[PDB]
Design a protein around this ligand. Structure first.
Ligand SMILES: Nc1ncnc2c1ncn2[C@@H]1O[C@H](COP(=O)(O)OP(=O)(O)OP(=O)(O)O)[C@@H](O)[C@H]1O
Ligand SMILES: [Mg+2]
Lengths: 47, 514, 464, 464, 49
C-alpha cells in the first residue's frame, strides 16, 4: 500500500516536473528564436 | 562504325544560320558570391533566363529601377564587370518527355550522366499553375511503397504528398528508394493505369551519393522508369533551388498526359537553404532562421503540383515524397513546420527507433496519413485496421514488460501481440514487399498466427512463410492481387497453409511452434 | 493616369504613380503579365507609401513574368468580394473570383474586405449561449452566440463530419448560413470538402472561400477577411445568423508574418509580425453579435510546438470563447461527434450564463468522466474485476454517460437515413441528471449509442 | 595598368582598377607593405566585383601596415600552388611557399587552387573497407577505402589525437602519397605531426600544407584548396592512391563567416555566411574519388558549442561516407577515442559489404547501447535494483561494451603512458559477439578499459 | 596583445615566459564593443566574426 502511495506521488511529481520542464523548454525555444532573429536583423540593419 | 561522325556535322553546317535579330543588352555592374547585378535590360521579366558571355546562365530574380539582380546557374567565376548580358525571352523552362526515363539531368534538363542527349518532347515552364480545386479528384488509388509500416499505418495514395521527415541517417532515402523499387512490378505490367514513373530529385547531395542511389535503382531494375534530377552540392545555389521545380515539371508533363508520377525530393531542407542563400545575397529581408518571407510559398508552390487530376484531365496523378532532415529530432523548426503544414501526412523516422532495430524506423502513432484508408486496398484496410490500436496499446504497456505475471490476461496478450507486430513491421533494406505479401504478413500478426512464434523468430517466420506461399500456394497472392480483397475461401486456405508451415518451422530457440 | 512597376522582389512590387494619383492603402491595383505561358492579371494590394509617389504592394498572385514599366491601373477600392445569396453554393478565392464557375458573381454587389468592427455602442453586452442541439456541446462546452470556438482535431476524428453537422444545424435550426474560410487550404483537402458538402447537399447553405497554400501569402492573409466580409453581409444585410468556419487561423497568423517579413518589418518575439495582436483583433472583433444577429465561428487552431504560450496561439486564444477538442480515442469508441468531454472546454460554463442546474449537471458529468478516465489504467492493466463495487458502479455509469454524449448527427443522415436529432437544452440537462444519478444504469450500453434524448433512449432500449 | 587600394577593413581590401583592367574573380593581386617591422608582399584574392571598376579582395597575409593608395598589381591568374612529386616531404603554406626550405618549389609546375569538381559521369560509390585497427571504428563506423571520412567533435574532445592516430594506422604502411592540410588547427600539433612523420620516415611520402589559426581568414579559407590541389594532382596526373587528411575543415567555413560581413553579405542563421552550403560543397566535392583514382580523405570537423545541430557540421554531414562523432559526454566518462557509438555511422556498414556476422554484432552492440542510454535516466534516480532482470543484465553488458570500445591508441601514449595496440577486425567482431552474448559478464568492467583485444582483456582481468 | 608582446621579446631572447590573460572573456566583450562602435556588422551573440 505504501508503495502504491509513494509511486502515485512519484508519478504526480514526475508529471509536474515534466510540465515545468516543458514550459521551460518552450521559453528557451522562443528565446533562441528571438535571439537568432535579433542577430540576423542586426546584421541586416548594419549592411 | 558509320558515316554519321561526319554527317551530323554536315547537317549542322547545312542547317546552321545565325540570323541578325535585335537584342536588348545589359552590362554586369556587380558580381559576387553567385549573384550578378545587370544594369539595363529594360524589358526583362521576373525569373527570366539571362545568358552571359561565357555560356553562363542566370535567373533575373530581383528587378529594381537600377539593376537586375540575377542568380547565376553555375560557372559563376567567369562573370565580370562590364560583360554583356543578353535576355532570352523565356521564363525558366525545362525540356520534358519520355526520354528522361533512366537519365540523370541537372535542374535545367541537360544530361549529366555522360550518355547522349535527351530527345525532349516539349518544354514546360517551371512556374506553371498547379491544378485548381475544380481540376482535382479524391485520392483513392494506393501507391504501394513496399514498406509494411507505411502501407499499413500511414498509407500513401497516388495524388498524396507524404513527408518522410527525420534526423540524419535514419532511413529516409532508403524508404524512398524502396518506394521507387516497388514500382517495378507495376511497370512490367505495361498498363499506364498501374505504371508509376519516378523522379528522384537530389538536392545538395554529394555526387557519389547520387551515384549510389542510381546504382541501387539499376541493380533493382528501377532505372528504366526513373529519372534523377540531380543538383549535387558542387552545383550553384540556383540549381539547388530549381531542382525540385525541374523534377516537378518533368513529372507534371507525364501527369497531364494520364500517367502516374512519384516525385522524391531529397531533401527539401537543402532547397530551402539554397533559397535562403540566394535571398540573403540579393538582400531580401530575412525572418525566422534568416529564411525569406516566402520560403513557405517556395515549398507550397512546389508540393501543390503533386495532385490527382480529374477524369477530364486524364486522371493522372503526381505523388510527392519530400524528405526533410530534422536537426536533433526538432520537428518544430521552421522548414519542418512549414512542410508538415503543407503535406498530407508524415512518416516520422527516429534515430532511437533505428538503433532499437525498429528500422525502417517510422514512429507509428506520431506518424499520420490524412488520406487514410482511402489509399489502401480493401484487403490491407481490413487486415491492418486493428494494427494501429494494437501498437498503441503495446507502447502503453511497454513499461510492464517485466511484470507480465502481474498483468491481466488480456493485457499480457496485448503485450505479446504488440511485440510480434513490432517485429513484423521491421523490413530489410532494398527489399520492398508486394501488396499481397504485405497483406499476408500483416494477416499473420493481426489475426494472431504469430502469437505462438517466438518474438526473435517472427522476422524469419514471416520471411519463410511468404517464401513458401509464393512458391507453392500462389493462389492466395493471385487472389489478393486480382481482387484486392482477402476472400473467405482464400483466408481459410491461408490459415491452413500457415498451420501446415508451423509444423515444419524450427524456432531459433529449438522449441516447436504450433 | 496609371502607375508603372519600378521594382519586383518576389511577391513585393513597387509602383510609381503620378504625383496626384497615388492610391490609398489597401487599394487593389491591376497589372498585366503578357507572357504567354504565365499570362495573368496580378492583383497588388497597396501596403505602404514609400514617397516620391511610390507605393509598395504585396502581389496576391505569383509575380513571375512581371516586367518593369508595365502599366498598373488603380481600381480605387480595396480588395472587394461578391456578397449576396449568390455566393452560397460556390467556392471563391480571397479576391472574390469564383473557382468552380469562372466569371460568376462579377456583377453582384461587391464589399471591401477591410471593414471596421461594430461600433462599441452596437455590441451585445450579454453573452448568449448558442443552443446548437448537440448534447455534448450544449452540456459540457456550450457555444457562445457571436463567439469563437477552437476546433482541435485532425484526420479521422470526424472534423469534417462535425463541420457538416454544424452547417446543417445553423441552416435548419437558426435559419442561418455558413461561410467556410479555408485559410491555407491544402487543395486536396479543399476539393474533398467541396465534394463532401455537395454530396451531403449542404453546399447550398455554405459559401466556400479558399485561399490555397500554393498562392503567395497575401491571399492567405486576406482570405479570412474575405470570408468574414461575406459573413458580415449575411449578418447585417440579409439578417441571418452566420457560422464562419476558419480552418486554420494559425495559417492566417503565419501569412501575416510572411507578409511582414517581405515588407521588411522587424520581426517580433518569436519571429511573428510586430502587429500580430492587432491583425488578429481586426479579424476576430468583426466576428460578433450585432442588432440581434451574430456571426459564430469555429476556428481550427494550430499550436506550434504544442506550446500554448507561443505568440500565435496566445493571441488567438484571447478571443476564443469555447474549445471543442475531437479525440481519436473517443472516435474509435463509436461516440460521434467525437468531442472529448474532458479536453474540451467553454468559458460560458459558469453558473451565471447557464442555469445553476446546467452547471451542476455538467460538473457532475465531468467528475464522473474524469474518475473513469483515471480508472482506465487499472481496467486496462489489472482488469475490470480488480475494482471496488463503487468503482464498478461508477465505471458503468461513466460508460453510459460518455456513450450518451454521442448523437445521431444530421450529417449522418446521408449515410443511414435516420433523421438527425436536435435535443433541447432542458431535455439534455434533465437526461444527464438522470444518468448521473443512476436512473438508467440498468439499460445495455448499446442503447445509449447515437440517440437524441430520453424518448429515443427509451425506444432504443425497448428495441434491444 | 595597376590597381590602387581604396578601402581597407581588416582582412578585406578594396582595389580600384582602370576600367579595362578589372581582374577576374579569384585572381591573385600583389600589394606591398613597406613598413619595416611588417614589410611584405601582400597577396589579395579578388572576391567580388563591386562596380565602378572596384573589386573587393580577401587578404592572405595580415593587412597591418597596408596604406591606402598603394599600387596593386594583378597576377592575371588565381593563386597557384606547386604540384608534383617534389611537394612530398616538405611543408608548404596556403600560398605554396615552402616553409622547411624557402624557395624550394618555385620552379615546379604550378596549379590554380580553384578548379571545378570532377564530373558526375566519373563518380562511382566506394564500398571497400579500410581496417584501421580501432575497435570502435572497425566495428561500428567502418571506414571506406577511397571514401570520405570525418571525425566530428566538440572543442577539445580528441579530434587531433584521433586524426594523428589515423595517420599512424593508415599512412605508415600506405604505398601511395599522403597529403595533410592543417586548416586553422593548432601550430603545436602541426609541428608535432611534422616531427612524428619525420621520425617514422613517412615524411618522404607526405606533403604538408599548413594554414594554421595564427593566419588571417584568407589563408584559413584557401589552404584547404591549396592542399586539395596537390591531392588532385596526385589523383589525376599520377594515379597513385592518395590519403588526404584535413584538420580542421570547419575552419574553412568559419573563415568564410569571418570575412562574410566585410564582403557585404547579410548573415544567415547563427551568424554564418549565406553561401555556407555552396562554399563548402565545392571544396568537399573536389575531395571525392573518381573511378580508378582514389583519394581516402579524413576530415576532422569541429562542432561549435558542442551542438551537432549547428549549420556547419549539419551541412558537412551530407558530404561524408563514414562519420565518427566524438562527444564530450563520452570523453568525460574517460572513454578514449571518445567516439559516440550511437551518433556515429558509416555507409559501408551493410550486411552486403562487411558481412552478416560483422553487421549483426555491430547492430546488437548499438541496440544494447541505445537501451542503456534509455535506461540511464531511470538508473540515476530509481536505482539499478528496480530494473528488470533482463534490463539489469543488459546494463551490465552495456557498461562493459562502452569500456571495451575504448582503446589504447598509439598516438595517445602520452595520454595514458601505456603503448598503443592494434586489434584485427576478426578479433573485434569475435570479442563483441562474446560480450553481447554474455561470455564476459563475470569479468569486472574496469578490466575492459583501455586494453584493445581479448588477450589484453584476459591479462587485465588477471591483474584485477 | 601588449602582454604577449612583452613576453615575446623575452621569448625570442631565449627566456621562458608564462603569460596569464585574466580574463579573455572580457577581451572578447571589449572587442565586441569596439566593433559595434565602428559599426562592423556582428555575428553570433553579437560578437564580430
Ligand atoms: N530498413 C533498413 N534496414 C536496415 N538498414 C537500413 C534500413 N534503412 C536504412 N538503413 C541503413 O541506414 C543507413 C541510413 O540510410 P539512408 O542513406 O537511407 O539514410 P537517410 O535518412 O537518407 O540519411 P542521409 O541524411 O545520410 O541521406 C544506411 O546504412 C542504410 O543502409
Ligand atoms: Mg538520404
Amino acid at each position: 500500500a505504501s508503495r502504491r502511495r509513494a509511486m502515485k506521488s512519484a508519478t504526480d511529481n514526475a508529471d509536474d516536473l515534466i510540465k515545468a520542464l516543458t514550459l521551460a523548454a518552450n521559453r528557451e525555444r522562443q528565446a533562441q528564436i528571438t535571439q537568432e532573429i535579433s542577430e540576423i536583423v542586426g546584421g541586416a540593419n548594419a549592411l | 562504325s558509320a558515316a554519321d561522325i561526319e554527317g551530323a556535322i554536315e547537317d549542322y553546317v547545312s542547317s546552321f544560320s545565325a540570323d541578325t535579330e535585335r537584342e536588348e543588352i545589359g552590362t554586369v555592374i556587380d558580381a559576387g558570391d553567385g549573384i550578378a547585378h545587370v544594369e539595363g535590360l529594360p524589358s526583362v521579366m521576373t525569373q527570366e533566363l539571362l545568358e552571359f558571355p561565357g555560356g553562363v546562365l542566370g535567373v533575373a530574380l530581383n528587378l529594381d529601377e537600377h539593376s537586375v539582380g540575377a542568380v547565376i546557374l553555375g560557372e559563376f567565376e567567369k562573370i565580370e564587370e562590364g560583360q554583356q548580358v543578353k535576355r532570352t525571352g523565356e521564363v525558366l523552362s525545362v525540356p520534358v518527355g519520355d526520354a528522361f526515363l533512366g537519365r540523370v539531368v541537372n535542374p535545367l534538363g541537360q544530361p549529366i550522366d555522360g550518355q547522349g542527349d535527351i530527345a525532349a518532347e516539349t518544354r514546360r515552364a517551371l512556374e506553371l499553375q498547379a491544378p485548381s480545386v475544380v481540376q482535382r479528384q479524391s485520392v483513392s488509388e494506393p501507391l504501394q511503397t513496399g514498406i509494411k509500416a507505411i502501407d499499413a499505418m500511414t498509407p500513401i495514395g497516388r495524388g498524396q504528398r507524404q513527408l518522410i521527415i527525420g534526423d540524419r541517417k535514419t532511413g529516409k532515402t532508403a524508404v524512398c528508394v524502396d518506394t521507387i523499387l516497388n514500382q517495378r512490378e507495376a511497370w512490367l505490367t505495361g498498363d499506364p493505369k498501374q505504371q508509376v514513373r519516378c523522379v528522384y530529385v537530389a538536392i545538395g547531395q554529394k555526387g557519389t551519393t547520387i551515384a549510389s542511389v542510381k546504382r541501387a535503382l539499376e541493380e533493382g531494375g528501377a532505372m528504366e522508369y526513373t529519372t534523377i534530377v540531380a543538383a549535387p552540392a558542387s552545383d550553384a545555389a540556383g540549381f539547388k533551388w530549381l531542382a525540385p521545380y525541374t523534377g516537378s515539371a518533368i513529372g507534371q508533363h507525364w501527369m497531364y498526359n494520364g500517367k502516374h508520377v512519384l516525385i522524391v525530393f531529397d531533401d527539401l531542407s537543402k532547397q530551402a537553404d539554397a533559397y535562403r542563400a540566394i535571398s540573403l545575397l540579393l538582400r531580401r529581408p530575412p525572418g525566422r532562421e534568416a529564411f525569406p518571407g516566402d520560403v513557405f510559398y517556395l515549398h507550397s508552390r512546389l508540393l501543390e503540383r503533386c495532385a490527382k487530376l480529374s477524369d477530364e484531365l486524364g486522371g493522372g496523378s503526381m505523388t510527392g515524397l519530400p524528405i526533410i532532415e530534422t536537426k536533433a529530432n526538432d520537428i518544430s523548426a521552421f522548414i519542418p513546420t512549414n512542410v508538415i503544414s503543407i503535406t498530407d501526412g508524415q512518416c516520422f523516422l527516429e534515430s532511437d527507433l533505428f538503433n532499437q532495430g525498429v528500422r525502417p524506423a517510422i514512429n507509428v502513432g506520431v506518424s499520420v496519413s490524412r488520406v487514410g484508408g482511402a489509399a489502401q486496398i480493401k484487403a490491407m484496410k481490413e487486415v491492418a485496421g486493428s494494427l494501429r490500436l494494437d501498437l498503441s496499446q503495446y507502447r502503453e504497456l511497454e513499461a510492464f514488460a517485466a511484470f507480465a505475471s502481474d498483468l491481466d490476461a488480456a493485457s499480457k496478450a496485448q503485450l505479446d501481440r504488440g511485440a510480434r507486430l513490432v517485429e513484423l513491421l521491421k523490413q530489410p533494406q532494398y527489399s520492398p514487399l508486394a501488396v499481397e505479401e504485405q497483406v499476408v504478413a500483416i494477416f499473420l500478426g493481426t489475426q494472431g498466427h504469430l502469437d505462438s512464434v517466438p518474438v526473435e523468430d517472427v522476422q524469419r517466420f514471416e520471411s519463410e512463410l511468404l517464401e513458401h506461399v509464393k512458391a507453392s500456394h500462389s493462389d492466395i497472392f493471385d487472389g489478393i492481387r486480382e481482387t484486392k480483397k482477402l476472400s473467405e475461401e482464400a483466408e481459410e486456405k491461408l490459415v491452413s497453409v500457415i498451420n501446415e508451415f508451423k509444423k515444419g518451422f524450427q524456432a531459433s530457440d529449438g522449441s516447436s511452434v504450433v | 493616369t496609371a502607375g508603372r512597376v519600378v521594382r519586383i522582389t518576389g511577391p513585393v512590387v513597387d509602383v510609381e504613380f503620378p504625383r496626384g494619383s497615388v492610391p490609398e492603402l489597401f487599394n487593389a491595383l491591376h497589372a498585366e503579365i503578357t507572357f504567354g505561358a504565365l499570362a495573368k492579371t496580378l492583383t497588388l494590394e497597396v501596403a505602404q507609401h514609400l514617397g516620391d509617389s511610390l507605393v509598395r504592394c504585396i502581389s496576391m498572385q505569383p509575380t513571375d513574368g512581371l516586367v518593369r514599366g508595365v502599366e498598373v491601373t488603380d481600381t480605387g477600392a480595396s480588395i472587394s468580394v461578391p456578397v449576396g445569396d449568390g455566393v452560397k453554393g460556390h467556392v471563391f478565392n480571397a479576391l472574390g473570383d469564383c473557382l468552380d464557375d469562372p466569371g460568376y458573381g462579377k456583377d453582384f454587389e461587391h464589399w471591401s474586405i477591410h471593414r471596421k468592427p461594430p461600433a462599441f455602442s452596437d455590441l451585445e453586452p450579454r453573452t448568449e449561449m448558442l443552443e446548437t442541439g448537440l448534447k455534448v456541446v450544449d452540456l459540457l462546452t456550450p457555444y457562445v452566440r457571436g463567439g469563437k470556438i477552437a476546433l482541435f482535431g485532425g484526420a479521422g476524428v470526424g472534423k469534417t463530419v462535425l463541420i457538416q453537422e454544424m452547417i446543417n444545424r445553423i441552416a435548419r435550426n437558426f435559419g442561418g448560413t455558413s461561410v467556410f474560410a479555408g485559410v491555407g487550404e491544402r487543395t486536396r483537402e479543399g476539393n474533398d470538402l467541396w465534394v463532401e458538402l455537395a454530396d451531403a447537399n449542404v453546399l447550398k447553405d455554405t459559401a466556400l472561400v479558399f485561399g490555397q497554400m500554393d498562392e503567395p501569402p497575401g491571399t492567405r492573409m486576406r482570405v479570412a477577411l474575405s470570408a468574414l466580409t461575406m459573413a458580415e453581409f449575411f449578418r447585417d444585410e440579409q439578417g441571418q445568423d452566420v457560422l464562419l468556419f476558419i480552418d486554420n487561423i494559425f495559417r492566417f497568423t503565419q501569412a501575416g508574418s510572411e507578409v511582414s517579413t517581405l515588407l521588411g518589418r522587424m520581426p517580433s518575439a518569436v519571429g511573428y509580425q510586430p502587429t500580430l495582436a492587432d491583425e488578429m483583433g481586426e479579424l476576430q472583433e468583426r466576428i460578433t453579435s450585432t442588432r440581434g444577429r451574430s456571426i459564430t465561428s469555429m476556428q481550427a487552431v494550430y499550436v506550434p510546438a504544442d506550446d500554448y504560450t507561443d505568440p500565435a496561439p496566445a493571441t488567438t486564444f484571447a478571443h476564443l470563447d469555447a474549445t471543442t477538442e475531437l479525440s481519436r480515442a473517443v472516435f474509435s469508441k463509436g461516440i460521434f461527434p467525437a468531442v472529448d468531454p474532458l479536453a474540451s472546454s467553454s468559458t460560458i460554463l459558469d453558473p451565471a450564463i447557464v442555469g445553476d442546474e446546467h452547471y451542476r449537471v455538467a460538473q457532475e458529468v465531468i467528475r464522473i468522466l474524469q474518475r473513469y478516465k483515471d480508472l482506465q489504467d487499472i481496467i486496462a492493466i489489472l482488469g475490470i474485476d480488480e475494482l471496488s463495487e463503487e468503482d464498478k458502479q461508477l465505471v458503468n455509469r461513466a460508460r453510459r454517460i460518455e456513450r450518451f454524449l454521442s448523437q445521431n448527427m444530421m450529417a449522418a443522415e446521408q449515410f443511414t437515413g435516420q433523421p438527425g436529432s436536435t435535443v433541447p437544452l432542458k431535455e439534455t440537462i434533465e437526461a444527464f441528471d438522470k444518468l448521473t444519478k443512476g436512473e438508467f444504469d440498468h439499460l445495455p450500453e448499446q442503447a445509449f449509442f447515437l440517440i437524441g434524448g430520453l424518448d429515443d433512449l427509451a425506444k432504443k432500449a425497448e428495441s434491444l
